[PDB]
Structure 1
Amino acid sequence: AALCLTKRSRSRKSLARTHGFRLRMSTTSGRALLKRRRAKGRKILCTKTNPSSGKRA
């Protein structure tokens, strides 16, 4: 049994659907979230992955 550690090596793709920008926008509430994350002025306003290669060194 793993110690009360909440996050495990779950797939990035699986995570993206739950909090993906595409997913975030469809809900009426989700579009609202973007409103705020832009009015504050954040830059990385999601956690996503990309179907090519989710990294640039």
Structure 2
Amino acid sequence: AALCLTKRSRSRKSLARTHGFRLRMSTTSGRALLKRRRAKGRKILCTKTNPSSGKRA
């Protein structure tokens, strides 16, 4: 059997369909969350992925 571990190896595409910027901007509630993120000063207001490339580092 497995352990009581919660996060696993789910694709970042499906994590970006739920917690990404689009479903965060498709509601009044989620854009109010982005009022609180931009009002606080977070450098990364979402946790996303990209349809083209991985990372520029």
Pairwise TM-score range, normalised by the shorter structure: over 0.9
Normalising by structure 2, what TM-score?
0.93
Alpha carbon RMSD of aligned pairs, Å?
0.7
Give the unaligned 5+ runs of structure 2.
none
Give aligned-pair identity as a percent: 100
Shift of 1:54: 2.5
**Structure 1 unaligned blocks of 5 or more:** none
Per-residue CA deviations over 1:2-45 (Å, capped at 9, x if unaligned) read 11110010000000000110110111100100000011000011
Which runs of at least 4 in structure 1 moved beyond 3 Å after TM superposition? none
SS for the counterpart of 2:23 is helix
TM-score (norm 1): 0.93
